[PDB]
Design a protein around this ligand. Structure first.
Ligand SMILES: Nc1ncnc2c1ncn2[C@@H]1O[C@H](COP(=O)(O)OP(=O)(O)O)[C@@H](O)[C@H]1O
Lengths: 56, 459, 576, 593
């Protein structure tokens, strides 16, 4: 049990190291598509539609 | 490719709450109320509770509140009509997470990054598009894989009374539910924290937490979101199994508590009650829940549904187990008497039935002797119960030679075949070999239900 | 255009709905959900919807179609899987290209793109035509060679124009009828309400047995073409080799995988009734309706199936109709009553359960189809049930009953037909056929019934008293009855030899078993000890127990000769 | 303020009440009767009144208090008896100078005049203090000393002024938290809604046994500290006596006895008996009553107040768990809560569930029993409290098929089913060993391995003996004892001895009021050894008929082992049991020689 307990920190460090690439990829994707998504969201929020209820 | 809509639909906020009683909130002057709509009641304390429109009139909307109507004020509660039925945001990353009853996360993780907004009620599968499931799963339990075999795509519940190890049996099936890589979705329905923690611990220990999504609705959780929990869990299962071509093993524990939630909601609507006060439409509700199993013609996926059920007073005649037997395909009957005698699993194979064993039994699927062995075991166990009753009533000496052999078989069958430790994973072939070692107690003449071409080859 | 006023599950009250009628289909909502009016009270008209009612908003228009729940009768019913209200599931899956049923689907019940080869009937232009008259026959497929298309019942006149022979669809007129001064046009198909039974010239007595195939049923509890059975294996046996010219399988509240099994087994299973092996689908129609589908559709599936069978016997074809789980139809009725608020009677069921079951079962029976040429059909109804109010109301109208024995089912003895509680009230009508074909069948059937009843009476005393000193005659009777239960009554449906035991083979096996019993009684009366006769005639006992294995494919002449040898061997062995 | 509009028993539909919330507390009537809202229909809000509604008149003002039913928590809770609503019965009696509960008494929940020796905790001025943190301990009594004053669970922020050590009344401010610029003053007591469970950091598996002190209970059907328990049984079975013998001698640090629909003389008996008993815990002979608080809502007191009494009891138990005490709340006659719910639903006209009960009875009971369970307290320092719920479900007519009994068995992990037939024979506590079970036997292996390693083995062995002899006696009652073998006769005699001298525990007796775990284990070992050695002797060839007469002395010594008073000490009684086992072995050796 002591041997297994000692490896928890090493296992945690190894898991943290592998994730760090995914965080970098997420940051890169966000930085690349931030302008496009922001433009789409703003253009959707402004310029509203105006339609009465279909049953009215 | 994929199609989606960046659309913003403003939502009407109604402060016009008329009255509130039980789980129901009645609004007063809704504009074009929509049936089965989801509304967000903003309490005076500021907390927001979701709802669901159950019935509408010209201007009224009898909203049921998932998180309970405690603290709702008729003069300060504002109802926000979203404009669509309850849609869960699903994703392929939803596997490995834990969600509350209402679909919100419990673990420290963030809100699920949506991949599609699926309606929880689902859509009816075309029966022409359903594939009959003829691929048995080797659950590892002897009394299931040998006499009540489960096919991958079958909705088979576990009828267990209060206090029996149905949780242990279902955890065992989940642990060793391979074929003769199952993704799992779990819908805890008012199970106590002890049972929920046991299920979570088993799923973590067996390595299943990497591929399972739990929908925990504890006994402390509100008693009306038990009506959203099965639908959320099953629409997640449908998403994974069909639209990701995955295999899913859904575990809807405490369908008795689900039916109790339906009774609580129905009795507050003053609807015409069925037997035991349950709603008349409870067959249709339980059908909408259970009938979301089975494989499909196009998508390589299967929802093997195992809804654990708590039959009160250990009775089949009770409406919940009765209608679950009507809808589902057989049942796994857990016996209080066997559990008291100390057998595990305490499965009583006499009320137990599996409607797809007739097709997934054998003759090239698992083994040539599977069906006949199962039939022989069931027949001799019925004979053993009859002989035990006869011996108890009119003495053991009056029992015939066949009856005495049946009693010996019953003893050696309960104590050596049904009796198996948890985390024991005997294959279907090992189960059949143990069954034969039981059936060799009888002479070859008294094994009539065995076909002779198999008797002469396996005796 | 009526407007929705209230929605609460299936029931949908609609306002501004004057001029409506009870049990009238109305398209509900913007998606045109099909719904039937169940209660009109002033402007309001309560509507049960046959689809998912979620998403209906107050103010959605509902429009009255002016007709009751109408099945579309015509060519193209064969080999089509239909939903509860006759929506073609195969066509829905093909059109939508998705595994789901689209909400408010409007696919036609009959195929409007298939050209049908139509041959005009004996009616010629100018000849007066009556309701139900056959004005032509159209080829459908190998089994239904002549799908004789009728004129709609309750329509008549002088045919002012009849189409010539050729290929036609279901959207092109094939006959014009002048009627009472108002011209009308008729097509290869014609609608008919499910609620209103199709008329007859005259119902007849059902005198021909429906060969269910199972030994227990076809021997002790016969069903006749035009009977009602209330069955609790036999579905396919009556489907494949019952000599029924057509069969309309109906499923109510079927478990999804059971319905899938039926849909995957009926197309695969083939019959050799014709000159070659031909599929059953060419003969059958499946009204498949799982439990998931709306309760209104579940309630309507029985009526759809029975009116399809009524059409196929108005054509003059002996048609069966296997209604799976009529208990689920009764449950649908109970749920509908609960939705409406009507006060239940008995065990929560509607008070009119007896009336509904009678109005459904009474549609059966051999009948002379109305209108020339003269022709007779028979809807043999085989409903399935699961002390219940539904079964105690069924037993008053059904003429046969095959109640399942729980003890015999626990012993894995199939079919688990309870011999004491079952009956068949055609055992007197069917003497006209037994005395003509197999003269000894009634007497031997009564002999076997008496033997089984005596064994049942003796078994109670056996169980209560250990059964050490039974008389020799009583021991012989009980052993003979145990042999009968093990060999004659028991029938492995999946086995090749006992898949379909013909009536002649059943009669011969009855002869063999009754002859064994008579020989045993004679030997006992001779004074010889049955304890010794057991060993002496073990060979004959094994012979009669293995007579079950005589394959019917050998032919009636061959098999009857084999049994005659066995009975001859029986008399010779009596010298022991 | 609204007005009464209709009264029908314990429901008061009050008109002109736009603005009342669900489960809000109202003061119905001129006497300010305490009532809670349960249904709202426009202006009229249907109120259930926790007081005798007789004499109410239409138009009597009803005041909306603006807060749900709240129990005051803090020092002074211990060693007091309360009504259903949080009212001290002693203070009510001394205020009314009468022996009756007057309608509408509003005595403060906790004695304000009594001054407590507050001693500040580790928290200093400026340190961030979250909900449930301990900022001081008051000296309540000699037994519940250091009644650690928690911060309210919903309160948070930074300390601005904490009171120095000294004596303070409850109304005196003790601490002031500044949170986002809005300072809030905190005192020794804080109100809490009874319906809302008190938050905890994280619940834990309950791995330590609630030693009831009764041999049958803690030797066959153990209950762990933090496990729900149920005691079904007809009248006279002994649910109340089991509950009292649990609250008298358990290992629980504090006890919240709840007499929801009990008898008045039972609560009077508790009030006079607890001060006369002393708990050996805390290193002194401090009285039991210094650790028990009582919520007495007797059977004839208002029907609606039974629910309030149950919720108040469980909230007090939750508070004392958050303090870090192994509480054991005891809900006497929990079925009376179900009957109160049925009566209120009948007044409301709501559609019934099975057997008259409302459709939500199962949900209410489940949410109540889920409050139990060991859990780490909410704030620093780390604390591990526990609430054990031992509720006596009282079936209607003695049949366990009652809806309340089924809805309780579905949630409780322990089932101490009592038998009326064993109760009649004075076979007490009359635990029906056939149907009773405890789902904590597997959990308690981790404790029985550390202490008393052979305890589980003996427990399964005695359950085997009892089951085998029950089946054998069932057969014999119809087939006579002629066909029994010598081993079967030994099983019958040994199980009769077990039932009549080990399982039976005569409470209200000097010797067997409290048979602790060590004496129970030693007696269990003696009984099991007697059975095993008798069976070995009969297998060696000695006839049982002669062996019974030869070893009647050993059998009577075994049956008389229950008379060893536990007060003699663990070492003394263990020595006596070792001597008895040696004498037993010698007697069998001499007999079989
Ligand atoms: N363990 C026990 N030891 C001695 N007497 C007991 C015991 N249990 C119950 N009794 C007797 O039972 C009576 C009280 O039973 P009680 O617990 O009040 O049952 P109920 O709660 O059903 O009324 C008392 O008179 C007492 O003498």
């Amino acid at each position: 049990e002591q041997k297994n307990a000692g490896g928890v920190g090493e296992l945690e460090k190894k898991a943290e190291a592998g994730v760090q690439g995914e965080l970098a990829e997420i940051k890169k994707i966000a930085e690349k598509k931030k302008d496009d998504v922001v433009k789409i969201l703003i253009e959707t929020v402004i310029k509203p539609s105006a339609e009465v209820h279909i049953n009215a | 490719a994929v199609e989606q809509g960046f659309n913003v639909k403003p939502r009407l906020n109604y402060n016009t709450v008329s009255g509130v009683n039980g789980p129901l909130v009645i609004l007063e002057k809704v504009k074009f109320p929509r049936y089965n709509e989801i509304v967000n009641l903003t309490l005076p304390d500021g907390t927001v509770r979701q709802g669901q429109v159950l019935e509408i009139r010209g201007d009224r909307a009898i909203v049921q509140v998932f998180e309970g109507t405690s603290g709702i004020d008729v003069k300060k509660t504002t109802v926000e009509f979203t404009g669509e039925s309850l849609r869960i945001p699903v994703s392929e990353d939803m596997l490995g997470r834990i969600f509350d009853g209402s679909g919100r996360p419990i673990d420290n993780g963030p809100k699920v990054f949506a991949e599609d907004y699926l309606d929880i009620n689902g859509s009816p599968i075309n029966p022409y598009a359903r594939i009959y499931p003829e691929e048995m799963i080797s659950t590892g339990v002897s009394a299931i894989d040998t006499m009540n075999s489960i096919a991958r795509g079958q909705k088979i519940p576990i009828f267990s009374a209060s206090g029996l190890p149905h949780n242990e049996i279902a955890a065992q099936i989940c642990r060793q539910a391979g074929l003769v890589n199952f993704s799992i979705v779990f819908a805890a329905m008012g199970v106590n924290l002890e049972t929920a923690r046991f299920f979570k611990q088993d799923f973590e220990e067996n390595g299943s937490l990497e591929r399972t999504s739990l929908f925990l609705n504890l006994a402390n959780d509100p008693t009306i979101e038990r009506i959203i929990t099965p639908r959320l869990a099953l629409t997640t299962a449908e998403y994974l199994a069909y639209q990701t071509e995955r295999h899913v093993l859904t575990i809807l524990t405490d369908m008795s508590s689900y039916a109790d939630a339906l009774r609580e909601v129905s009795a507050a609507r003053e609807e015409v009650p069925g037997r035991r006060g349950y709603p008349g439409y409870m067959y249709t509700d339980l059908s909408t829940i259970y009938e979301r199993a089975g494989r499909v013609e196009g998508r390589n996926g299967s929802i093997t549904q195992i809804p654990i059920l708590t039959m009160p007073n250990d009775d089949i005649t009770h409406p919940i187990p009765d209608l679950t037997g009507y809808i589902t395909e057989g049942q796994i009957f857990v016996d209080r008497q066997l559990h008291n005698k100390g057998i595990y699993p305490p499965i009583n194979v006499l009320p137990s039935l599996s409607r797809l064993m007739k097709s997934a039994i054998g003759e090239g699927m698992t083994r040539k002797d599977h069906g006949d062995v199962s039939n022989q075991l069931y027949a001799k166990y019925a004979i053993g119960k009859d002989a035990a009753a006869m011996k108890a009533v009119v003495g053991e000496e009056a029992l015939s030679i066949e009856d005495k052999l049946s009693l010996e078989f019953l003893e050696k069958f309960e104590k050596t075949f049904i009796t198996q430790g948890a985390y024991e994973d005997r294959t279907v072939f090992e189960s059949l070999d143990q069954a034969w070692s039981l059936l060799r107690i009888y002479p070859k003449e008294m094994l009539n239900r065995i076909s002779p071409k198999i008797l002469d080859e396996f005796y | 255009y009526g407007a929705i006023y209230s929605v609460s599950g299936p029931v949908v009250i609609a306002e501004n709905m004057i001029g409506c009628a009870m049990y009238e289909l109305v398209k509900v909502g913007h998606d045109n959900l099909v719904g039937e009016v169940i209660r009109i009270d002033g402007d309001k008209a309560t509507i049960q919807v046959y689809e998912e009612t979620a998403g209906l908003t107050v103010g959605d228009p509902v429009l009255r179609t002016g007709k009751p729940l109408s099945v579309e009768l015509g060519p193209g019913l064969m080999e089509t899987i239909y939903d509860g209200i006759q929506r073609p599931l195969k066509a829905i899956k093909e059109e939508s290209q998705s595994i789901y049923i689209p909400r408010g689907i409007d696919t036609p019940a009959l195929d409007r793109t298939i050209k049908w080869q139509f041959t005009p009937g004996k009616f010629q232009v100018g000849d007066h035509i009556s309701g139900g008259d056959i004005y032509g026959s159209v080829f459908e497929n190998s089994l239904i060679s002549s799908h004789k298309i009728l004129l709609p019942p309750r329509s008549r006149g002088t045919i002012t124009w009849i189409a010539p022979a050729g290929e036609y669809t279901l959207d092109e007129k094939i006959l014009e009828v002048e009627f009472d001064g108002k011209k009308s046009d008729f097509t290869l198909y014609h609608t008919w309400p499910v609620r209103v039974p199709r008329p007859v010239t005259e119902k007849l007595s059902a005198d021909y047995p429906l060969l269910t195939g199972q030994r227990v049923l076809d021997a002790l509890f016969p069903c006749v073409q035009g009977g009602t059975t209330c069955i609790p294996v036999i579905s396919q046996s009556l489907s494949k080799y019952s000599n029924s010219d057509a069969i309309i399988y109906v499923g109510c509240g079927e478990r999804g995988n059971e319905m899938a099994e039926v849909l995957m087994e009926f197309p695969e299973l083939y019959t050799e009734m014709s000159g070659t092996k031909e599929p059953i689908m060419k003969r059958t129609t499946l009204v498949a309706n799982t439990s998931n589908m709306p309760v209104a559709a579940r309630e309507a599936s029985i009526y759809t199936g029975i009116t399809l069978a009524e059409y196929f016997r108005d054509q003059g074809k002996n048609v069966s109709m296997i209604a799976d789980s009529s208990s689920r139809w009764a449950e649908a009725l109970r749920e509908i009553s609960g939705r409406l608020g009507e006060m239940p009677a008995d065990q929560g069921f509607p008070a009119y359960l007896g009336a509904k079951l009678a109005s459904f079962y009474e549609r059966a029976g051999k009948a002379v189809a109305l209108g020339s040429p003269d022709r007779t059909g028979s809807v043999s109804i085989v409903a399935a049930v699961s002390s219940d109010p539904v079964t105690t109301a069924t037993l008053g109208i059904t003429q046969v009953f095959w109640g399942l024995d729980k003890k015999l089912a626990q012993r894995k003895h199939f079919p688990s037909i309870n011999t004491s509680v079952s009956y068949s009230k055609y055992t007197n009508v069917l003497n006209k056929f037994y005395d003509s074909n197999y003269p000894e069948f009634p007497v031997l059937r009564d002999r076997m019934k008496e033997i089984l009843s005596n064994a049942e009476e003796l078994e109670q005393v056996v169980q209560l008293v250990g059964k050490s000193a039974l008389s020799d005659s009583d021991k012989i009777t009980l052993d003979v009855a145990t042999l009968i239960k093990e060999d004659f009554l028991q029938q492995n449906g999946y086995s090749t030899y006992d898949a379909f035991c013909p009536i002649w083979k059943t009669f011969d096996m009855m002869r063999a078993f009754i002859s064994y019993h008579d020989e045993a009684q004679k030997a006992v009366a001779n004074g010889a000890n049955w304890s010794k006769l057991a060993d002496s005639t073990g060979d004959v006992k094994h012979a009669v127990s293995s007579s079950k294995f005589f394959e019917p494919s050998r032919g009636e002449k061959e098999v009857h000769g084999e049994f005659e040898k066995l009975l001859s061997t029986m008399q010779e062995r009596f010298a022991e």
